[PDB]
Ligand binder design. Structure first.
Ligand SMILES: O=c1[nH]c2cc(C(F)(F)F)c(N3CCOCC3)cc2n(CP(=O)(O)O)c1=O
Ligand SMILES: O=c1[nH]c2cc(C(F)(F)F)c(N3CCOCC3)cc2n(CP(=O)(O)O)c1=O
Lengths: 260, 261
């Protein structure tokens, strides 16, 4: 009767403790979602084992083989009982697994060098002295390609033809580009990482407050699982108890390195 | 079993009477964000529906004396409605008795200031007293501060609970009026969605401070075991992913706003 939790290494959601080599079981891991799992299990009454998903992916269906990979696949195919991770609640995923209400709300956001006079996607869209881009693949790029909102379609039209390319191979390449470009590159990215990067040395980037869309991370369970319902009630309870915000403060801001 | 009874609530700009409503019948008497949302949900789920305004004008809570649900939640629980399509907050006590979709709008407690004022953050307010600040004298925003064990909010609560003259107001309109008339010495704490709305209202003298203090959601609600719950949830996700919910926010807040940029 031990519940198999699948999760994914993504700081500060799930991290290896520095001393993980000298620990066993669930004690090897720490982070926002490690704490969330313990609170969920307490409030629902279950024992559990943490596992890192074998392929390191969140979960998508291969168009050509119909096969889910990532944590979604592990749920669909019987390898784990629950996923506790910053796993985006999406239609195609909700067609095959069950999601709790979100424990975190987030969206696409703008990163600038600390000190840059920009304040919105609208600002970016109607000028050209500041370049801006996204990851060369994934949901943020797809959001701009797929979108029918003029401001963002304008940004996409600028991005898809910019020379030299305004796209980067990794989030880290993106952040570095903001840092070296003396205010002439802005990076578009998931908002929790923007905030996380804003709070650590070298303390030279800012998240622009307003987000460009609204998305959530939720706890995932296979369709018809007896757990989905209680787990969902737990997520709502923890939010209202302030626990979800406490953990965000714990893992993002309490050891912040930049004062503000 | 071939007309779906939608319960909702008169709350601007979610549901409103059209100017000429008396010359109209049925669902055409109404307009607004949730009226449009109801039309999209129905089209995507393939049902016909009738808008009805909740008899008691309430969202949903248990009576202190009888423990019986009032508001739209009650109309779902006790069989009077098939679906609630309204800015109904997703909460633990409500989700125990009815089902919610994933949120179609995300929001939180926010700060309102007079347009032109050196304040932003909850943290700033907690560190000073020149600028008084308060909430509605009842409801979820007040309960958030009273309940919070987070230091900055507990500081703000300890300030508000004893501040004299009272920083609490009897109505949303009284709070707004107090911001407008206090020359920057009064900030109001209220739901982010209404703050944004008030910002788009004449005489255009209030501003929403950007970052929120907590995170909630509004969802579509159905009675437990409804056949609709699953389809409605996927319809909500599709509408978010297609950009449709954001277009509706823009329509009823900024297009029909009185202050634009
Ligand atoms: O479920 C999903 N959850 C995700 C959660 C996050 C994070 F922010 F780390 F919490 C991220 N980060 C985006 C920025 O660089 C670091 C990784 C990607 C996610 N992806 C793939 P995407 O949606 O293509 O980005 C998913 O699929
Ligand atoms: O489900 C709920 N949805 C709510 C939606 C709204 C609005 F923003 F108008 F859409 C408001 N407004 C708060 C600001 O002044 C006007 C009314 C209250 C709501 N309440 C009561 P609360 O949570 O105690 O505030 C609920 O219970």
């Amino acid at each position: 009767k031990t519940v198999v939790v699948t999760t994914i290494l993504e700081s500060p959601y799930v991290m290896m403790k520095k001393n993980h080599e000298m620990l066993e079981g669930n004690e090897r891991y720490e982070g926002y979602c490690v704490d969330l799992a313990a609170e969920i299990a307490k409030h629902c009454g279950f024992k559990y084992k943490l596992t890192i998903v074998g392929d390191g992916k969140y979960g998508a269906r291969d168009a050509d083989t119909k096969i889910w990979n990532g944590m979604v696949g592990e749920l669909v195919y019987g390898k784990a009982d629950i996923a506790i991770a910053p796993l985006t609640i999406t239609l195609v995923r909700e067609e095959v697994i069950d999601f709790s209400k979100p424990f975190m709300s987030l969206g696409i956001s703008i990163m600038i060098k600390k000190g840059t006079p920009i304040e919105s996607a609208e600002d970016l869209s109607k000028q050209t002295e500041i370049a801006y881009g996204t990851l060369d693949s994934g949901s943020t790029k797809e959001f701009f390609r797929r979108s029918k909102i003029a401001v963002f379609d304008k940004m996409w039209t600028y991005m898809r033809s910019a020379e030299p390319s305004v796209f980067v191979r990794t989030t880290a390449e993106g952040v570095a580009r903001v840092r070296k470009s003396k205010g002439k590159y802005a990076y578009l990215l998931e908002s929790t990482m923007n905030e996380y990067i804003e709070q650590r040395k070298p303390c030279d980037t800012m998240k622009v407050c307003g987000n460009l869309d609204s998305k959530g991370y939720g706890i995932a369970t296979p369709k018809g699982s007896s757990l989905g319902n209680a787990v969902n009630l737990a997520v709502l309870k923890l939010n209202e108890q302030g626990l979800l915000d406490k953990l965000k403060n714990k893992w993002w801001y309490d050891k912040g390195e930049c004062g503000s």
